[PDB]
Amino acid sequence: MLNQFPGQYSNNIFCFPPIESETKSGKKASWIICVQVVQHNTIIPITDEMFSTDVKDAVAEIFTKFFVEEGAVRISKMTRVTEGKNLGKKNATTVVHQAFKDALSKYNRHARQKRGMIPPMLVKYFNIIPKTFFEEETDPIVQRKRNGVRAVACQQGDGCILLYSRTEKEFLGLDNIKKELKQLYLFIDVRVYLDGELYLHRKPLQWIAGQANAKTDSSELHFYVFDCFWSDQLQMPSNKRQQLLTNIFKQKEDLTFIHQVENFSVKNVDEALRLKAQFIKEGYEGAIVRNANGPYEPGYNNYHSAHLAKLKPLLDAEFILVDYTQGKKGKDLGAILWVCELPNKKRFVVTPKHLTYADRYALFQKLTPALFKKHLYGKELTVEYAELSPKTGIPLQARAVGF
DNA sequence: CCAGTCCGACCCGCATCCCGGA
DNA sequence: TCCGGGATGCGT
DNA sequence: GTCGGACTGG
Numbered sequence: 001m002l003n004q005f006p007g008q009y010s011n012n013i014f015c016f017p018p019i020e021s022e023t024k025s026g027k028k029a030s031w032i033i034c035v036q037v038v039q040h041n042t043i044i045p046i047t048d049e050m051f052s053t054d055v056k057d058a059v060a061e062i063f064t065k066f067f068v069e070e071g072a073v074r075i076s077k078m079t080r081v082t083e084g085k086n087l088g089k090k091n092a093t094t095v096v097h098q099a100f101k102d103a104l105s106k107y108n109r110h111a112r113q114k115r116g117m118i119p120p121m122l123v124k125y126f127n128i129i130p131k132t133f134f135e136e137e138t139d140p141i142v143q144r145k146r147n148g149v150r151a152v153a154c155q156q157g158d159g160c161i162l163l164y165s166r167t168e169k170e171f172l173g174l175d176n177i178k179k180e181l182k183q184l185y186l187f188i189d190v191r192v193y194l195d196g197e198l199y200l201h202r203k204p205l206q207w208i209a210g211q212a213n214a215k216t217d218s219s220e221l222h223f224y225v226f227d228c229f230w231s232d233q234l235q236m237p238s239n240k241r242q243q244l245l246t247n248i249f250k251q252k253e254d255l256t257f258i259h260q261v262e263n264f265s266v267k268n269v270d271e272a273l274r275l276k277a278q279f280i281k282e283g284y285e286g287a288i289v290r291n292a293n294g295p296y297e298p299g300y301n302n303y304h305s306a307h308l309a310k311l312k313p314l315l316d317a318e319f320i321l322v323d324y325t326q327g328k329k330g331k332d333l334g335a336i337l338w339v340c341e342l343p344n345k346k347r348f349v350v351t352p353k354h355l356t357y358a359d360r361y362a363l364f365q366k367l368t369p370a371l372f373k374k375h376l377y378g379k380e381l382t383v384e385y386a387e388l389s390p391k392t393g394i395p396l397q398a399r400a401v402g403f
Numbered sequence: 404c405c406a407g408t409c410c411g412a413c414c415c416g417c418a419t420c421c422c423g424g425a
Numbered sequence: 426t427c428c429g430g431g432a433t434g435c436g437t
Numbered sequence: 438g439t440c441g442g443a444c445t446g447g
Binding site for chain 1: 407408409410411412413414415416417418419421422423
């Protein structure tokens with residue numbers, strides 16, 4: 001039945017309740033996700049029988065609208081679902097029920113991101129440092145970049161320790177860090193937020209992310225705090241936030257699972273790059289540079305702050321193009337994707353980096369499995385990536401720049 | 404894209420839960 | 426019982 | 438995390 005989901009039903013189109021957002025300019029924004037069923041280019045009504053029996057040749061379409069107050073309306077392309085999932089079993093879904101099951105998931109995840117949890121700050125600049133970072137009266141601060149899971153810790157009026165993630169999701173386990181945080185908040189400032197990283201030295205990102213998301217309390221990770229902020233003084237410049245953070249750890253520097261990262265003041269770009277090369281040789285991901293006057297700009301709407309810089313080695317390699325495919329939903333349906341192979345014959349999907357969507361559309365509509373095997377099979381695709389997968393050798397965070 | 408800001412779609416890896424086929 | 430694949434929801 | 442598109446006037 002439709003009334004079991006939040007939202008109204010009008011003109012054969014179900015519209016979830018609009019989720020209110022807050023833009024950077026202080027203007028209200030709205031986001032609505034809708035579901036409609038199309039058969040022979042016609043919007044047919046949604047009946048209860050569609051949740052247990054599939055109407056043949058009928059397609060359910062998921063689309064969304066986003067508009068700022070008094071602004072234009074942005075309507076995404078239709079996410080066409082054409083078949084249910086687990087079609088052979090008891091837990092099988094139909095085309096309509098799977099569409100509402102997927103639309104409600106897009107709704108619940110979207111409601112969590114919008115508005116005492118505050119999204120952590122995010123880095124905008126990659127391997128470049130703006131000259132404005134050194135034109136300030138105070139030197140910028142360079143830190144070690146640990147390849148772990150982002151986490152923010154704060155205290156509630158109840159007294160419990162709240163420890164959430166980058167997407168504002170409360171970590172279930174990690175009890176060993178919650179204990180030290182509870183003991184820590186007995187001495188230090190009551191209403192301060194501790195922004196840091198979940199990490200264990202010499203451990204891969206895949207192992208760190210797994211233990212951070214597991215309900216099992218293995219209690220292995222450490223909390224490396226690199227920043228702090230108060231909710232009422234988000235405009236506090238970075239250098240003052242670093243000084244106050246150091247005074248916090250001068251109280252109790254003997255915590256087992258909570259540590260403060262080391263700050264390095266630099267005068268020019270090489271002093272940063274020399275420490276970057278030093279940190280890489282120590283086994284770290286790279287280096288983070290912080291503007292001295294930069295305030296704490298929370299990651300609302302996945303915003304990236306221009307007062308931070310990330311210095312990381314960008315690795316490249318050549319891979320053997322073997323097959324091709326396409327995206328599944330929305331604007332990616334009909335857009336070509338590359339498939340490369342490894343010495344062990346395992347495959348992976350790569351996205352072309354320097355193509356318009358018209359090129360990827362036209363490439364997929366003009367290619368056949370016979371035309372591909374005649375012209376492009378076996379070619380070399382240079383691929384940028386952050387790291388190689390330590391278990392399967394797959395280039396991770398990979399994108400194809402060309403041939 | 405004039406940048407800026409924001410959305411939307413995707414890669415792999417892992418945790419978990421649901422299911423059969425053994 | 427036992428083990429895999431599917432599906433989902435996290436993370437970089 | 439990646440990147441393209443597209444609205445915004447930061």
